[PDB]
Amino acid sequence: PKEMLRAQTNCILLNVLKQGDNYVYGIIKQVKEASNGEMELNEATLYTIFDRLEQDGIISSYWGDESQGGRRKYYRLTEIGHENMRLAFESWSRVDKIIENLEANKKSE
Amino acid sequence: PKEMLRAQTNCILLNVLKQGDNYVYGIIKQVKEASNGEMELNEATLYTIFDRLEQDGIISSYWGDESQGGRRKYYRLTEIGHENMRLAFESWSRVDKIIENLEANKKSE
Predict the structure, then answer these.
(1) Mutation site for A-interface testing, chosen from B15, B102, B109 by largest number of A Cβ within 10 Å
(2) Is A86 domain-assigned?
(3) What is the CATH number of the domain that holds B66?
(4) Chain A contacts of B84, Cβ < 8 Å?
(5) What residue numbers bound the domain in which B64 lies?
(6) Is residue A71 one of the residues assigned to a domain?
(7) Chain B interface residues facing chain A, Cβ-Cβ under 8 Å?
(8) Which UniProt keywords are given for this protein, alphabetically ordered (chains A, B) (predicted)?
(9) How many domains does chain B have?
(10) What are the residues of chain A with a beta carbon less than 8 Å away from any beta carbon of chain B?
């Protein structure tokens, strides 16, 4: 779907922030880099997601670069956010185990 | 969260049907089997999901033939449903590549 896309886009984003705090264009560049140019995120899309995540307590922002040229919003993964990433990762690898078992449980029958 | 679980239950369920057509208690048993008893799915929750998937054209149901003891409802993964599974699988493995790259791109720097 386009929902499929939105969960997939969240994952990538959180994994960017996981590598380090960052700002919009910084984040977009890493995605472009790590997708060999294929995935080009939008500012609007990134911010739309980042607003949701911020409210739900997954990420927090803060100001920087006041002295560099002008204010920039940076984003960071909260302690809750780190936990939920670990939880998601744990759960999905668990889903992978269950799925491989279902394919062996068919050989059994 | 809750909406993470729903996404996982879904993944498991579609992968059960992927192994073959099946009915509710048959499905529940396979999940219990393949999760070493950890995941015991609820009928209401399974049907709630199965109604959504059926409406969106992802799965169809039908009656067994050899149903003297009483009618048995089977479930089956549609054409569309198979495609979406292939799409999802393709996309998520792509997401995994992008994620591994992000972690190497940071090791570099």
Answers:
(1) B102
(2) no
(3) 1.10.10.10
(4) 1
(5) 2-78
(6) yes
(7) 1, 4, 7-8, 11-12, 15-16, 19-20, 30-31, 33-35, 39, 84, 87-88, 91-92, 95, 98-99, 101-103, 105-106
(8) Metal-binding
(9) 1
(10) 1, 4, 7-8, 11-12, 15-16, 19-20, 30-31, 33-35, 39, 84, 87-88, 91-92, 94-95, 98-99, 101-103, 105-106
Asked whether residue A109 is assigned to any structural domain, the reply reads: no
Side chain identity, residue B21: D
Resolution of the experimental model, in Å, one decimal: 2.7
- Is residue B109 in some structural domain? no
